[PDB]
């Protein structure tokens, strides 16, 4: 058994966050993220298993050649992962782990054995994207084209079929919040009987 995972996708300012972000918020002990791995010295205070799984960087790269992680990536001369085991361990304990990862981050889970639920959140236009972002008064001319220019990537793939199993067009938040839990009914349901 077990509630399964949850992928959200979509272009950055679409309000895949900010959904999440309210998701997180109404929620009590239904969703949770997954324990990364990471190479860091830890840090005094952080208990290994709650705050990251401290590991050397030489069981860091063998792990990494061994497709044991999800994602990974380098930071500040560190090296952090997102390990199947991980997301497993969240689904041990009842609870729904949410992965928040870009378009090929999608395709990374696909080919893994898990089996979580894919869900993208789209703008409703790329003119509507772009209104969006404008108006939150962070990005530069030329920050928006490339930001366009990869939301655009991601809208075409979303179209592409098996892909996505719910697609929320984001035109209110309230709307999308509502498509988003009416999606994860099932699973929430699981979270809840315990």
Same mark, same amino acid.
């Given at each position: 058994?077990?509630?399964?995972?949850?992928?959200?996708?979509?272009?950055?300012?679409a309000?895949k966050?900010?959904?999440? #972000?309210?998701?997180?918020?109404?929620?009590?002990?239904?969703?949770?993220?997954?324990?990364?791995?990471?190479?860091?010295?830890?840090?005094?205070?952080?208990?290994?298993?709650?705050?990251?799984?401290?590991?050397?960087?030489?069981?860091?790269?063998?792990d990494?050649?061994?497709?044991?992680?999800?994602?990974?990536?380098?930071?500040?001369?560190?090296?952090?992962?997102?390990?199947?085991?991980?997301?497993?361990?969240?689904?041990?304990?009842?609870?729904?782990?949410?992965?928040?990862?870009?378009?090929?981050?999608?395709?990374?889970?696909?080919?893994?054995?898990?089996?979580?639920?894919?869900?993208?959140?789209?703008?409703?236009?790329?003119?509507?994207?772009?209104?969006?972002?404008?108006?939150?008064?962070?990005?530069?001319?030329?920050?928006?084209?490339?930001?366009?220019?990869?939301?655009?990537?991601?809208?075409?793939?979303?179209?592409?079929?098996?892909?996505?199993?719910?697609?929320?067009?984001?035109?209110?938040?309230?709307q999308?919040?509502?498509?988003?839990?009416?999606?994860?009914?099932?699973?929430?349901? #699981?979270?809840?009987?315990?």
């Open positions: 058994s077990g509630p399964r995972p949850v992928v959200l996708s979509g272009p950055s300012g309000g966050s900010t959904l999440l #972000k309210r998701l997180l918020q109404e929620h009590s002990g239904i969703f949770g993220f997954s324990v990364s791995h990471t190479t860091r010295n830890p840090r005094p205070g952080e208990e290994n298993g709650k705050d990251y799984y401290f590991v050397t960087r030489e069981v860091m790269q063998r990494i050649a061994a497709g044991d992680f999800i994602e990974h990536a380098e930071f500040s001369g560190n090296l952090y992962g997102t390990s199947k085991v991980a997301v497993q361990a969240v689904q041990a304990m009842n609870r729904i782990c949410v992965l928040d990862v870009d378009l090929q981050g999608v395709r990374n889970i696909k080919a893994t054995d898990l089996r979580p639920i894919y869900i993208s959140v789209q703008p409703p236009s790329l003119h509507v994207l772009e209104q969006r972002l404008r108006q939150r008064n962070t990005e530069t001319e030329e920050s928006l084209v490339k930001r366009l220019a990869a939301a655009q990537a991601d809208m075409e793939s979303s179209k592409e079929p098996g892909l996505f199993d719910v697609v929320i067009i984001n035109d209110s938040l309230d999308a919040y509502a498509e988003l839990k009416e999606a994860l009914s099932e699973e929430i349901k #699981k979270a809840q009987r315990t």
